Design a protein around this ligand. Structure first.
Ligand SMILES: [Ca+2]
Length: 117
């Protein structure tokens, strides 16, 4: 049952919205800097995973991806308008995207994921 949008409250990993799957963009909004948005997706077979989050408002935001054991496997690179990055998932399991805004008022966004998901 893939999602197309975040589902509040999703302010922790235990309440993360998901799963996210390739080919189905996910919409949300960072409401203000106190809004933390967590998502999850499942890796079923080893492979490269790519994440692109289009920033559809002004502000500083970024994301980190965690594995099930709270290790960070991937951090965002800002190109100005997209927060992107990729990693090699050596092991199947659930991964979590932690998205937040460190400095901004209001940010819509759109998550796209590609690869072995
Ligand atoms: Ca949230």
């Amino acid at each position: 049952y893939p999602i197309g949008t975040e589902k509040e409250p999703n302010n922790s990993k235990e309440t993360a919205s998901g799963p996210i799957v390739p080919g189905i963009p996910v919409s949300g909004t960072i409401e203000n800097t106190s809004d933390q948005d967590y998502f999850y997706f499942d890796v079923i077979t080893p492979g490269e995973v790519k994440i692109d989050i289009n920033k559809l408002g002004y502000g500083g935001a970024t994301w980190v991806v965690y594995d099930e054991n709270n290790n960070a496997v991937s951090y965002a690179t800002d190109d100005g308008q997209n927060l992107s990055g990729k990693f090699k998932a050596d092991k199947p399991g659930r991964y979590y995207i932690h998205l937040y805004m460190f400095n901004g008022s209001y940010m819509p966004y759109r998550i796209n994921i590609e690869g072995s998901v």
